[PDB]
C-alpha cells in the first residue's frame, strides 16, 4: 500500500507516534517519505547482506528476522515480512523500540540527512488530524 501524506499522518497519530520520545508527527512522516516514499512494500538490500523493510525501512540485522541475515538479532520479534503489510502496526511498534534505543531518530539515515533540523511541520500541514 502506498499511503497518502495525510492518511499516513493520521494512521501514525492513531498509533501513538505523535510526540513519541519527543519527536513530533512531522518527523515520522518525513522519515517515511524519504525512507520508502510512503510505500509499505519497499525493500532495499544493504551491502552487509541485511535488508531494510517497509515504510520506515527497518533493518533485518537487528530488528526483524528474514531468514537470510546471518548472525542478526530479531529485537522486534517479528518476521521482516510483517513490516510490509498495509497495516502499519507492526512497523510502528518496532519503530517505537528503535527510537528508544538511544540514538533517537538518528537511526534512520534519511531522517538524519533530510528531515533533521528542517521544518518538519510542513509534512502535516493541511491534514485533518
Amino acid at each position: 500500500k502506498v499511503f497518502g501524506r495525510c492518511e499516513l499522518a493520521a494512521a501514525m497519530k492513531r498509533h501513538g507516534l505523535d510526540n513519541y520520545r519527543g519527536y513530533s508527527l512531522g518527523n515520522w512522516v518525513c522519515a517515511a517519505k524519504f525512507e520508502s516514499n510512503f510505500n509499505t512494500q519497499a525493500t532495499n538490500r544493504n551491502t552487509d547482506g541485511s535488508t531494510d523493510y517497509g515504510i520506515l525501512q527497518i533493518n533485518s540485522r537487528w530488528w526483524c528476522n528474514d531468514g537470510r541475515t546471518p548472525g542478526s538479532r530479531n529485537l522486534c520479534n517479528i518476521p521482516c515480512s510483517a513490516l510490509l503489510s498495509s497495516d502499519i502496526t507492526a512497523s510502528v511498534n518496532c519503530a517505537k523500540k528503535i527510537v528508544s534505543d538511544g540514538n533517537g531518530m538518528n537511526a534512520w539515515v534519511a531522517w538524519r540527512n533530510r528531515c533533521k533540523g528542517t521544518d518538519v511541520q510542513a509534512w502535516i500541514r493541511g491534514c485533518r488530524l
Side-chain angles (χ1 to χ4, degrees):
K1 177 182 171 168
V2 181
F3 273 85
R5 178 172 67 75
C6 300
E7 182 188 21
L8 176 65
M12 283 180 158
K13 187 153 177 284
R14 222 231 318 164
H15 283 90
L17 283 187
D18 188 21
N19 310 299
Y20 191 77
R21 292 289 158 148
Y23 297 85
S24 67
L25 198 57
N27 291 281
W28 296 110
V29 171
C30 182
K33 171 64 185 174
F34 296 121
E35 282 295 345
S36 73
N37 206 20
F38 294 149
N39 184 1
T40 62
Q41 299 199 76
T43 56
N44 288 102
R45 191 86 199 253
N46 301 127
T47 58
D48 69 354
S50 66
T51 297
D52 296 340
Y53 297 80
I55 206 159
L56 290 169
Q57 289 293 276
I58 290 173
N59 181 267
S60 69
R61 174 79 59 212
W62 316 99
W63 308 100
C64 61
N65 183 41
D66 66 9
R68 64 166 195 199
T69 312
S72 69
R73 295 258 273 166
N74 176 5
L75 298 180
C76 291
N77 264 289
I78 48 164
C80 299
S81 55
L83 299 172
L84 303 180
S85 176
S86 48
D87 184 325
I88 68 173
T89 304
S91 279
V92 167
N93 290 346
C94 183
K96 283 185 177 161
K97 293 192 183 68
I98 295 172
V99 73
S100 291
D101 189 56
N103 308 290
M105 282 200 70
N106 294 298
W108 285 276
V109 178
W111 176 80
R112 195 198 324 131
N113 288 334
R114 308 187 64 181
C115 298
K116 188 170 191 174
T118 65
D119 183 28
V120 295
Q121 195 277 321
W123 290 101
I124 61 173
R125 65 85 176 47
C127 314
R128 183 166 39 229
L129 275 329

PDB file of all heavy atoms in Angstrom, residues 35 42-54 56-64 66 68-70 72 80 107-110:
ATOM      1  N   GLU A  35      12.324   7.445   3.468  1.00  0.00           N
ATOM      2  CA  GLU A  35      12.793   6.126   3.594  1.00  0.00           C
ATOM      3  C   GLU A  35      12.128   5.184   2.546  1.00  0.00           C
ATOM      4  O   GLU A  35      12.778   4.451   2.002  1.00  0.00           O
ATOM      5  CB  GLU A  35      12.473   5.597   4.949  1.00  0.00           C
ATOM      6  CG  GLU A  35      13.427   6.123   6.036  1.00  0.00           C
ATOM      7  CD  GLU A  35      14.899   5.681   5.910  1.00  0.00           C
ATOM      8  OE1 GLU A  35      15.114   4.715   5.132  1.00  0.00           O
ATOM      9  OE2 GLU A  35      15.780   6.286   6.532  1.00  0.00           O
ATOM     10  N   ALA A  42       8.131  -1.421   0.357  1.00  0.00           N
ATOM     11  CA  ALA A  42       9.507  -1.102  -0.011  1.00  0.00           C
ATOM     12  C   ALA A  42      10.545  -2.038   0.661  1.00  0.00           C
ATOM     13  O   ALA A  42      10.479  -2.313   1.812  1.00  0.00           O
ATOM     14  CB  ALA A  42       9.892   0.518   0.282  1.00  0.00           C
ATOM     15  N   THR A  43      11.495  -2.506  -0.106  1.00  0.00           N
ATOM     16  CA  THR A  43      12.596  -3.246   0.385  1.00  0.00           C
ATOM     17  C   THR A  43      13.873  -2.706  -0.214  1.00  0.00           C
ATOM     18  O   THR A  43      13.883  -2.255  -1.340  1.00  0.00           O
ATOM     19  CB  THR A  43      12.498  -4.692   0.082  1.00  0.00           C
ATOM     20  OG1 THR A  43      12.346  -4.871  -1.304  1.00  0.00           O
ATOM     21  CG2 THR A  43      11.313  -5.375   0.784  1.00  0.00           C
ATOM     22  N   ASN A  44      14.983  -2.749   0.487  1.00  0.00           N
ATOM     23  CA  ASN A  44      16.318  -2.364  -0.081  1.00  0.00           C
ATOM     24  C   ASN A  44      17.412  -3.189   0.593  1.00  0.00           C
ATOM     25  O   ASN A  44      17.389  -3.315   1.813  1.00  0.00           O
ATOM     26  CB  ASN A  44      16.541  -0.882   0.172  1.00  0.00           C
ATOM     27  CG  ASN A  44      15.637   0.008  -0.716  1.00  0.00           C
ATOM     28  OD1 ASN A  44      14.607   0.549  -0.263  1.00  0.00           O
ATOM     29  ND2 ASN A  44      15.967   0.065  -2.015  1.00  0.00           N
ATOM     30  N   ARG A  45      18.274  -3.813  -0.195  1.00  0.00           N
ATOM     31  CA  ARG A  45      19.343  -4.654   0.332  1.00  0.00           C
ATOM     32  C   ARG A  45      20.571  -3.823   0.598  1.00  0.00           C
ATOM     33  O   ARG A  45      20.845  -2.927  -0.096  1.00  0.00           O
ATOM     34  CB  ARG A  45      19.756  -5.673  -0.708  1.00  0.00           C
ATOM     35  CG  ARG A  45      20.720  -6.870  -0.265  1.00  0.00           C
ATOM     36  CD  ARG A  45      19.839  -7.909   0.251  1.00  0.00           C
ATOM     37  NE  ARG A  45      20.511  -8.892   1.102  1.00  0.00           N
ATOM     38  CZ  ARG A  45      20.768 -10.170   0.685  1.00  0.00           C
ATOM     39  NH1 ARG A  45      20.518 -10.508  -0.523  1.00  0.00           N
ATOM     40  NH2 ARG A  45      21.138 -11.082   1.495  1.00  0.00           N
ATOM     41  N   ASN A  46      21.222  -4.098   1.713  1.00  0.00           N
ATOM     42  CA  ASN A  46      22.444  -3.350   2.183  1.00  0.00           C
ATOM     43  C   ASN A  46      23.624  -4.135   1.774  1.00  0.00           C
ATOM     44  O   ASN A  46      23.538  -5.293   1.566  1.00  0.00           O
ATOM     45  CB  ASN A  46      22.389  -3.165   3.726  1.00  0.00           C
ATOM     46  CG  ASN A  46      21.137  -2.404   4.119  1.00  0.00           C
ATOM     47  OD1 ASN A  46      20.316  -2.817   4.970  1.00  0.00           O
ATOM     48  ND2 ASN A  46      20.923  -1.347   3.366  1.00  0.00           N
ATOM     49  N   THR A  47      24.734  -3.507   1.700  1.00  0.00           N
ATOM     50  CA  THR A  47      25.986  -4.231   1.361  1.00  0.00           C
ATOM     51  C   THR A  47      26.409  -5.328   2.325  1.00  0.00           C
ATOM     52  O   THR A  47      27.004  -6.264   1.865  1.00  0.00           O
ATOM     53  CB  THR A  47      27.242  -3.297   1.269  1.00  0.00           C
ATOM     54  OG1 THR A  47      27.421  -2.604   2.537  1.00  0.00           O
ATOM     55  CG2 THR A  47      26.959  -2.225   0.165  1.00  0.00           C
ATOM     56  N   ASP A  48      26.113  -5.175   3.619  1.00  0.00           N
ATOM     57  CA  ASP A  48      26.383  -6.226   4.605  1.00  0.00           C
ATOM     58  C   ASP A  48      25.443  -7.447   4.493  1.00  0.00           C
ATOM     59  O   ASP A  48      25.558  -8.331   5.309  1.00  0.00           O
ATOM     60  CB  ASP A  48      26.349  -5.608   6.062  1.00  0.00           C
ATOM     61  CG  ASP A  48      24.982  -5.201   6.479  1.00  0.00           C
ATOM     62  OD1 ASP A  48      23.990  -5.227   5.717  1.00  0.00           O
ATOM     63  OD2 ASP A  48      24.796  -4.868   7.614  1.00  0.00           O
ATOM     64  N   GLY A  49      24.510  -7.454   3.535  1.00  0.00           N
ATOM     65  CA  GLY A  49      23.582  -8.566   3.335  1.00  0.00           C
ATOM     66  C   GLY A  49      22.270  -8.387   4.081  1.00  0.00           C
ATOM     67  O   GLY A  49      21.340  -9.203   3.877  1.00  0.00           O
ATOM     68  N   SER A  50      22.143  -7.381   4.937  1.00  0.00           N
ATOM     69  CA  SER A  50      20.884  -7.202   5.634  1.00  0.00           C
ATOM     70  C   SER A  50      19.958  -6.513   4.651  1.00  0.00           C
ATOM     71  O   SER A  50      20.462  -6.033   3.629  1.00  0.00           O
ATOM     72  CB  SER A  50      21.135  -6.400   6.839  1.00  0.00           C
ATOM     73  OG  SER A  50      21.533  -5.087   6.490  1.00  0.00           O
ATOM     74  N   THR A  51      18.656  -6.424   4.977  1.00  0.00           N
ATOM     75  CA  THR A  51      17.691  -5.795   4.097  1.00  0.00           C
ATOM     76  C   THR A  51      16.873  -4.893   4.946  1.00  0.00           C
ATOM     77  O   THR A  51      16.667  -5.183   6.156  1.00  0.00           O
ATOM     78  CB  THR A  51      16.844  -6.856   3.397  1.00  0.00           C
ATOM     79  OG1 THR A  51      17.667  -7.664   2.576  1.00  0.00           O
ATOM     80  CG2 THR A  51      15.877  -6.232   2.374  1.00  0.00           C
ATOM     81  N   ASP A  52      16.433  -3.755   4.364  1.00  0.00           N
ATOM     82  CA  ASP A  52      15.534  -2.767   5.048  1.00  0.00           C
ATOM     83  C   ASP A  52      14.105  -2.987   4.526  1.00  0.00           C
ATOM     84  O   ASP A  52      13.947  -3.229   3.339  1.00  0.00           O
ATOM     85  CB  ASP A  52      15.968  -1.352   4.682  1.00  0.00           C
ATOM     86  CG  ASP A  52      17.353  -1.009   5.170  1.00  0.00           C
ATOM     87  OD1 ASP A  52      17.842  -1.675   6.089  1.00  0.00           O
ATOM     88  OD2 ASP A  52      18.021  -0.081   4.667  1.00  0.00           O
ATOM     89  N   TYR A  53      13.087  -2.949   5.437  1.00  0.00           N
ATOM     90  CA  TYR A  53      11.751  -3.340   5.112  1.00  0.00           C
ATOM     91  C   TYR A  53      10.755  -2.320   5.539  1.00  0.00           C
ATOM     92  O   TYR A  53      10.750  -1.809   6.656  1.00  0.00           O
ATOM     93  CB  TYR A  53      11.417  -4.671   5.770  1.00  0.00           C
ATOM     94  CG  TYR A  53      12.105  -5.828   5.443  1.00  0.00           C
ATOM     95  CD1 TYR A  53      13.340  -6.109   5.979  1.00  0.00           C
ATOM     96  CD2 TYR A  53      11.659  -6.670   4.399  1.00  0.00           C
ATOM     97  CE1 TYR A  53      14.132  -7.276   5.540  1.00  0.00           C
ATOM     98  CE2 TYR A  53      12.402  -7.806   3.970  1.00  0.00           C
ATOM     99  CZ  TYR A  53      13.657  -8.084   4.536  1.00  0.00           C
ATOM    100  OH  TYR A  53      14.293  -9.108   4.204  1.00  0.00           O
ATOM    101  N   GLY A  54       9.835  -2.081   4.642  1.00  0.00           N
ATOM    102  CA  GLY A  54       8.724  -1.258   4.937  1.00  0.00           C
ATOM    103  C   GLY A  54       8.823   0.237   4.858  1.00  0.00           C
ATOM    104  O   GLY A  54       9.735   0.775   4.437  1.00  0.00           O
ATOM    105  N   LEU A  56       9.123   2.400   7.075  1.00  0.00           N
ATOM    106  CA  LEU A  56      10.194   3.001   7.817  1.00  0.00           C
ATOM    107  C   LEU A  56      11.574   2.305   7.620  1.00  0.00           C
ATOM    108  O   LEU A  56      12.515   2.551   8.356  1.00  0.00           O
ATOM    109  CB  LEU A  56       9.904   3.121   9.292  1.00  0.00           C
ATOM    110  CG  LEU A  56       8.791   4.184   9.603  1.00  0.00           C
ATOM    111  CD1 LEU A  56       8.382   4.059  11.006  1.00  0.00           C
ATOM    112  CD2 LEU A  56       9.332   5.489   9.313  1.00  0.00           C
ATOM    113  N   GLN A  57      11.636   1.436   6.621  1.00  0.00           N
ATOM    114  CA  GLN A  57      12.827   0.740   6.269  1.00  0.00           C
ATOM    115  C   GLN A  57      13.688   0.131   7.379  1.00  0.00           C
ATOM    116  O   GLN A  57      14.847   0.480   7.595  1.00  0.00           O
ATOM    117  CB  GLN A  57      13.784   1.716   5.415  1.00  0.00           C
ATOM    118  CG  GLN A  57      13.242   1.964   4.050  1.00  0.00           C
ATOM    119  CD  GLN A  57      13.239   0.722   3.126  1.00  0.00           C
ATOM    120  OE1 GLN A  57      14.267   0.491   2.557  1.00  0.00           O
ATOM    121  NE2 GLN A  57      12.120  -0.120   3.056  1.00  0.00           N
ATOM    122  N   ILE A  58      13.006  -0.685   8.185  1.00  0.00           N
ATOM    123  CA  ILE A  58      13.583  -1.332   9.376  1.00  0.00           C
ATOM    124  C   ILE A  58      14.444  -2.473   9.017  1.00  0.00           C
ATOM    125  O   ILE A  58      14.108  -3.320   8.135  1.00  0.00           O
ATOM    126  CB  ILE A  58      12.480  -1.755  10.274  1.00  0.00           C
ATOM    127  CG1 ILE A  58      11.890  -0.503  10.841  1.00  0.00           C
ATOM    128  CG2 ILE A  58      12.944  -2.651  11.433  1.00  0.00           C
ATOM    129  CD1 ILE A  58      10.561  -0.764  11.712  1.00  0.00           C
ATOM    130  N   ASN A  59      15.646  -2.477   9.563  1.00  0.00           N
ATOM    131  CA  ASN A  59      16.770  -3.306   9.127  1.00  0.00           C
ATOM    132  C   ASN A  59      16.774  -4.713   9.800  1.00  0.00           C
ATOM    133  O   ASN A  59      16.561  -4.879  10.998  1.00  0.00           O
ATOM    134  CB  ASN A  59      18.070  -2.560   9.393  1.00  0.00           C
ATOM    135  CG  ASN A  59      19.374  -3.353   8.929  1.00  0.00           C
ATOM    136  OD1 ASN A  59      19.973  -4.055   9.681  1.00  0.00           O
ATOM    137  ND2 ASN A  59      19.710  -3.277   7.710  1.00  0.00           N
ATOM    138  N   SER A  60      17.025  -5.728   8.974  1.00  0.00           N
ATOM    139  CA  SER A  60      16.945  -7.149   9.376  1.00  0.00           C
ATOM    140  C   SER A  60      18.206  -7.613  10.129  1.00  0.00           C
ATOM    141  O   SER A  60      18.304  -8.568  10.721  1.00  0.00           O
ATOM    142  CB  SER A  60      16.842  -8.079   8.140  1.00  0.00           C
ATOM    143  OG  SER A  60      18.110  -8.095   7.353  1.00  0.00           O
ATOM    144  N   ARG A  61      19.206  -6.768  10.176  1.00  0.00           N
ATOM    145  CA  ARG A  61      20.398  -7.008  11.008  1.00  0.00           C
ATOM    146  C   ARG A  61      20.158  -6.923  12.516  1.00  0.00           C
ATOM    147  O   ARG A  61      20.602  -7.809  13.258  1.00  0.00           O
ATOM    148  CB  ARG A  61      21.414  -6.039  10.657  1.00  0.00           C
ATOM    149  CG  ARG A  61      22.680  -6.039  11.530  1.00  0.00           C
ATOM    150  CD  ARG A  61      23.686  -7.103  11.234  1.00  0.00           C
ATOM    151  NE  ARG A  61      24.179  -7.021   9.847  1.00  0.00           N
ATOM    152  CZ  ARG A  61      24.527  -8.123   9.183  1.00  0.00           C
ATOM    153  NH1 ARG A  61      24.445  -9.325   9.806  1.00  0.00           N
ATOM    154  NH2 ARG A  61      24.809  -8.129   7.896  1.00  0.00           N
ATOM    155  N   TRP A  62      19.217  -6.085  12.934  1.00  0.00           N
ATOM    156  CA  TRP A  62      18.861  -6.044  14.354  1.00  0.00           C
ATOM    157  C   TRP A  62      17.399  -6.284  14.725  1.00  0.00           C
ATOM    158  O   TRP A  62      17.154  -6.749  15.837  1.00  0.00           O
ATOM    159  CB  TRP A  62      19.257  -4.661  14.921  1.00  0.00           C
ATOM    160  CG  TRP A  62      20.466  -4.266  14.517  1.00  0.00           C
ATOM    161  CD1 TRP A  62      20.721  -3.407  13.508  1.00  0.00           C
ATOM    162  CD2 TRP A  62      21.710  -4.551  15.133  1.00  0.00           C
ATOM    163  NE1 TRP A  62      22.071  -3.152  13.431  1.00  0.00           N
ATOM    164  CE2 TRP A  62      22.712  -3.848  14.413  1.00  0.00           C
ATOM    165  CE3 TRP A  62      22.086  -5.369  16.195  1.00  0.00           C
ATOM    166  CZ2 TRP A  62      24.128  -3.960  14.706  1.00  0.00           C
ATOM    167  CZ3 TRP A  62      23.473  -5.492  16.510  1.00  0.00           C
ATOM    168  CH2 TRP A  62      24.493  -4.782  15.752  1.00  0.00           C
ATOM    169  N   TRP A  63      16.484  -5.926  13.823  1.00  0.00           N
ATOM    170  CA  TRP A  63      15.108  -5.771  14.276  1.00  0.00           C
ATOM    171  C   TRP A  63      14.093  -6.765  13.910  1.00  0.00           C
ATOM    172  O   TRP A  63      13.080  -6.917  14.568  1.00  0.00           O
ATOM    173  CB  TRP A  63      14.593  -4.394  13.880  1.00  0.00           C
ATOM    174  CG  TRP A  63      15.565  -3.280  14.361  1.00  0.00           C
ATOM    175  CD1 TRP A  63      16.479  -2.660  13.588  1.00  0.00           C
ATOM    176  CD2 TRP A  63      15.759  -2.790  15.699  1.00  0.00           C
ATOM    177  NE1 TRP A  63      17.164  -1.723  14.347  1.00  0.00           N
ATOM    178  CE2 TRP A  63      16.803  -1.888  15.643  1.00  0.00           C
ATOM    179  CE3 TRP A  63      15.187  -3.080  16.955  1.00  0.00           C
ATOM    180  CZ2 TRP A  63      17.277  -1.205  16.807  1.00  0.00           C
ATOM    181  CZ3 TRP A  63      15.657  -2.413  18.079  1.00  0.00           C
ATOM    182  CH2 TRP A  63      16.639  -1.487  17.993  1.00  0.00           C
ATOM    183  N   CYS A  64      14.337  -7.399  12.834  1.00  0.00           N
ATOM    184  CA  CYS A  64      13.390  -8.436  12.366  1.00  0.00           C
ATOM    185  C   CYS A  64      14.124  -9.617  11.751  1.00  0.00           C
ATOM    186  O   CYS A  64      15.295  -9.548  11.378  1.00  0.00           O
ATOM    187  CB  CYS A  64      12.374  -7.873  11.369  1.00  0.00           C
ATOM    188  SG  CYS A  64      13.154  -7.170   9.810  1.00  0.00           S
ATOM    189  N   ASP A  66      14.481 -12.284   8.700  1.00  0.00           N
ATOM    190  CA  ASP A  66      14.173 -12.539   7.347  1.00  0.00           C
ATOM    191  C   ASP A  66      14.738 -13.846   6.884  1.00  0.00           C
ATOM    192  O   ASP A  66      14.574 -14.221   5.726  1.00  0.00           O
ATOM    193  CB  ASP A  66      14.587 -11.436   6.405  1.00  0.00           C
ATOM    194  CG  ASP A  66      16.041 -11.212   6.258  1.00  0.00           C
ATOM    195  OD1 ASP A  66      16.810 -12.057   6.788  1.00  0.00           O
ATOM    196  OD2 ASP A  66      16.397 -10.211   5.538  1.00  0.00           O
ATOM    197  N   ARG A  68      17.738 -14.733   6.258  1.00  0.00           N
ATOM    198  CA  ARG A  68      18.915 -14.760   5.358  1.00  0.00           C
ATOM    199  C   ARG A  68      19.965 -13.654   5.803  1.00  0.00           C
ATOM    200  O   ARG A  68      20.635 -13.079   4.924  1.00  0.00           O
ATOM    201  CB  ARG A  68      18.513 -14.504   3.938  1.00  0.00           C
ATOM    202  CG  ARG A  68      17.926 -13.097   3.687  1.00  0.00           C
ATOM    203  CD  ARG A  68      17.897 -12.838   2.142  1.00  0.00           C
ATOM    204  NE  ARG A  68      17.707 -11.465   1.805  1.00  0.00           N
ATOM    205  CZ  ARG A  68      17.280 -11.022   0.609  1.00  0.00           C
ATOM    206  NH1 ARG A  68      17.088 -11.910  -0.384  1.00  0.00           N
ATOM    207  NH2 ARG A  68      17.154  -9.716   0.358  1.00  0.00           N
ATOM    208  N   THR A  69      19.944 -13.239   7.082  1.00  0.00           N
ATOM    209  CA  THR A  69      20.947 -12.200   7.591  1.00  0.00           C
ATOM    210  C   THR A  69      21.647 -12.917   8.732  1.00  0.00           C
ATOM    211  O   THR A  69      21.181 -12.899   9.822  1.00  0.00           O
ATOM    212  CB  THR A  69      20.237 -10.936   8.074  1.00  0.00           C
ATOM    213  OG1 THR A  69      19.301 -10.578   7.028  1.00  0.00           O
ATOM    214  CG2 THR A  69      21.213  -9.817   8.336  1.00  0.00           C
ATOM    215  N   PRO A  70      22.658 -13.668   8.425  1.00  0.00           N
ATOM    216  CA  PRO A  70      23.427 -14.412   9.407  1.00  0.00           C
ATOM    217  C   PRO A  70      23.853 -13.582  10.598  1.00  0.00           C
ATOM    218  O   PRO A  70      24.270 -12.456  10.576  1.00  0.00           O
ATOM    219  CB  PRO A  70      24.671 -14.830   8.568  1.00  0.00           C
ATOM    220  CG  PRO A  70      24.004 -15.107   7.144  1.00  0.00           C
ATOM    221  CD  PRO A  70      23.117 -13.940   7.031  1.00  0.00           C
ATOM    222  N   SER A  72      22.093 -12.158  12.895  1.00  0.00           N
ATOM    223  CA  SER A  72      21.368 -10.933  13.128  1.00  0.00           C
ATOM    224  C   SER A  72      20.443 -11.166  14.340  1.00  0.00           C
ATOM    225  O   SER A  72      20.101 -12.265  14.748  1.00  0.00           O
ATOM    226  CB  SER A  72      20.552 -10.547  11.856  1.00  0.00           C
ATOM    227  OG  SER A  72      19.502 -11.494  11.708  1.00  0.00           O
ATOM    228  N   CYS A  80      10.440 -10.102   9.130  1.00  0.00           N
ATOM    229  CA  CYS A  80      10.527  -8.834   8.426  1.00  0.00           C
ATOM    230  C   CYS A  80       9.289  -8.624   7.483  1.00  0.00           C
ATOM    231  O   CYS A  80       8.815  -7.447   7.289  1.00  0.00           O
ATOM    232  CB  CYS A  80      11.831  -8.745   7.695  1.00  0.00           C
ATOM    233  SG  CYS A  80      13.283  -8.820   8.677  1.00  0.00           S
ATOM    234  N   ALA A 107      18.791   6.929  13.959  1.00  0.00           N
ATOM    235  CA  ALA A 107      18.817   5.522  13.460  1.00  0.00           C
ATOM    236  C   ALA A 107      18.351   5.469  12.047  1.00  0.00           C
ATOM    237  O   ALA A 107      18.721   4.580  11.331  1.00  0.00           O
ATOM    238  CB  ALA A 107      17.961   4.571  14.319  1.00  0.00           C
ATOM    239  N   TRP A 108      17.553   6.411  11.596  1.00  0.00           N
ATOM    240  CA  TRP A 108      17.045   6.495  10.247  1.00  0.00           C
ATOM    241  C   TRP A 108      17.903   7.535   9.503  1.00  0.00           C
ATOM    242  O   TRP A 108      17.799   8.707   9.799  1.00  0.00           O
ATOM    243  CB  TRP A 108      15.585   6.873  10.213  1.00  0.00           C
ATOM    244  CG  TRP A 108      14.752   5.717  10.617  1.00  0.00           C
ATOM    245  CD1 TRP A 108      14.335   4.702   9.833  1.00  0.00           C
ATOM    246  CD2 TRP A 108      14.151   5.527  11.877  1.00  0.00           C
ATOM    247  NE1 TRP A 108      13.442   3.937  10.538  1.00  0.00           N
ATOM    248  CE2 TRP A 108      13.288   4.417  11.804  1.00  0.00           C
ATOM    249  CE3 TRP A 108      14.260   6.164  13.013  1.00  0.00           C
ATOM    250  CZ2 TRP A 108      12.675   3.841  12.867  1.00  0.00           C
ATOM    251  CZ3 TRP A 108      13.571   5.674  14.081  1.00  0.00           C
ATOM    252  CH2 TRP A 108      12.711   4.560  14.028  1.00  0.00           C
ATOM    253  N   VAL A 109      18.789   7.042   8.638  1.00  0.00           N
ATOM    254  CA  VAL A 109      19.680   7.860   7.894  1.00  0.00           C
ATOM    255  C   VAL A 109      18.995   8.976   7.052  1.00  0.00           C
ATOM    256  O   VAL A 109      19.450  10.095   6.985  1.00  0.00           O
ATOM    257  CB  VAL A 109      20.562   6.920   6.830  1.00  0.00           C
ATOM    258  CG1 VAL A 109      21.478   7.812   5.994  1.00  0.00           C
ATOM    259  CG2 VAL A 109      21.377   5.887   7.611  1.00  0.00           C
ATOM    260  N   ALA A 110      17.953   8.678   6.354  1.00  0.00           N
ATOM    261  CA  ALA A 110      17.183   9.665   5.613  1.00  0.00           C
ATOM    262  C   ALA A 110      16.612  10.719   6.538  1.00  0.00           C
ATOM    263  O   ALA A 110      16.511  11.848   6.151  1.00  0.00           O
ATOM    264  CB  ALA A 110      16.119   9.045   4.729  1.00  0.00           C
TER     265      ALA A 110
END
